[PDB]
Amino acid sequence: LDNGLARTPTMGWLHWERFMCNLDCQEEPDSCISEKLFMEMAELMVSEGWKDAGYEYLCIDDCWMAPQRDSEGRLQADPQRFPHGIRQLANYVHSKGLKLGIYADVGNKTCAGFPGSFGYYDIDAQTFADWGVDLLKFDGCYCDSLENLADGYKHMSLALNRTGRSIVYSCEWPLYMWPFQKPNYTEIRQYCNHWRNFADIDDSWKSIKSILDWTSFNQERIVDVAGPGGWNDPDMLVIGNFGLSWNQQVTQMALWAIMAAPLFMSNDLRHISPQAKALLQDKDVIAINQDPLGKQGYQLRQGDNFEVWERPLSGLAWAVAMINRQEIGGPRSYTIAVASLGKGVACNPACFITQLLPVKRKLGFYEWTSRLRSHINPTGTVLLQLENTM
């Protein structure tokens, strides 16, 4: 969506994966979804310098709303968990320099069961627009046929621009067309800043593998329509939780960067490993994912439990991934023709490769004939960045 927004993969935090739809603010007041929760989080992003690194969007997902519309017929946050109301929440969020995001649903209900938005789009839009929202996650649970769906996404999309408020619009449209018919991504892209493609994501290696395996096996349709204004969105970053091994975490991070994917954490920033936060904030990696160019990466090679990904950057510079899909054993070694890498370009004739992960080391120069070798840990990933001698 060309609204001059998301001219770079959006960076922020989303409560979903880490807190799901928790409401028991009795025996569990800290995992409970409340303005108190976010308010805390907001503080932090600023504290441990998350904002400084790039994450600037704090967003609420499903289950933030009270059971039903008000006398006026607009939504309303749960009275008990959000007594002061979004608006005010937003103002704090803004006071702290951040931007707020809210969750909504095109159909008759959110995947949570709460209020939908069907035949309310316009109203709701103005609502948020007035509440002071900056970003909308438009989910699509509950709706007759794509007619109601497609139209709803499209419709709402227009409703917002109309409001005048600059709102990053994040669709989930595609994820729902499957498996009835491949979506017209060129279409969608004219309506979203970024959309979901695959199922949600567990705090697990499996869930991640499938997503890659999926985005791998589909680049034909998606990898292309990617670029400023509109991005392909895998899902939140579960790095900092528990389901992932170390080498599994670098992987997600490394690859989300390769796939110009929106960066949304879903972790408790209050209790997060230092080792984790380090990765999550690596200036050089965020830079790659935040490349101004907006050219989504893709899998180059397959075979021998090895995956080779790469994304062209700006200035003849290229980013490259090396995933060791071998669940057992130890660190294997992979070697490739420096030349037949950056589509032949990057490295002609000179190349400067600096391992940017998992240890940002300074490898030497590489000739077009030079052959590159490196070892990769099981389920891990070695991220490289190449510079051409120009």
Next chain:
Amino acid sequence: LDNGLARTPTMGWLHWERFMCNLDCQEEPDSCISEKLFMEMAELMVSEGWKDAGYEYLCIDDCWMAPQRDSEGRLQADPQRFPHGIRQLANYVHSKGLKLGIYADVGNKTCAGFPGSFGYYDIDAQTFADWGVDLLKFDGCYCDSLENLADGYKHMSLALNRTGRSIVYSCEWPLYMWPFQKPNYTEIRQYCNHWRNFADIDDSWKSIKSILDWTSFNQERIVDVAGPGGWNDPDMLVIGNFGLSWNQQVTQMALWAIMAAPLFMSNDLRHISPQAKALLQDKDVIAINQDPLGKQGYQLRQGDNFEVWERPLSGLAWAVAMINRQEIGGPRSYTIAVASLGKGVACNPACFITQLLPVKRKLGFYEWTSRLRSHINPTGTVLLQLENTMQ
């Protein structure tokens, strides 16, 4: 096998999972399976105090052997990767105060393709016995019918006892009885210090989950025949590698302890996290697994993505596991009736529970009535130890 060995779950290291069958000592010398490597390892176990914690067995798995017998007919380690035959290495192993273990195969070939042992049992036995071996991993790849199999395991078993050398014999027999018939474990137990039951183990969470679930859904047959001399063996400990997250590592360790399982690491003790080594050596946890009693634990409860395991120990003390099988979200909380725990016993009248994992904390006293509540991380595990008293 009542040979006065493994009167406690055997503790050691086995190169398999961490190094598999690596032979390229040209372009991959560090992973390469050679006497040089084992010598290093040996040294270390002693260094960072692994020996002190309990691990006392250093074992070689498949791919340690040269292509075929010698003139005499016995077995010979690969000439190049094992220039000093075995014996000598065993002296260095023995020197450090450790015990060595070697891999062999009942059939015509090891799962690697190397020399078998079919119609050589006796010879081989004496061989190892001579070489100064302390433990044998008898694998079972390649063989006609269980006839050849069952007999081979049984046969070899006797061959060793005969040699006179005290050799911990670790079978894989069962893993190979399926798909034919559930194993006369009472039989097997009269021939092994411990045997394999389920497929190999990847450096992955999945591989572990399946083993638990598989074992979970079989206790009827196995959990019972467990005790001194003979143990149920899951597989190596992949803690210290990369496939497991933190919460996932405590789990394996916590549960192997619950399942009086042999403790065999498969990691590079050179490049091993400090945080890892800490767990692997936790005195209180090793103690549980090393319980003198020899009563294998078992899953008590199911449901809601929660698993409750427990093993009775010695002195009216009980060990308890709490696995959060919920792959997504955050740390949930589980609460149970202190009473209906240690089969009703432990916690009558008082129960002193000290979280022994993942943070060994000192919880207070608990009465029979008492209700114990605790939160558990996703894919993680909270290990508890209850002792009986009367304050």
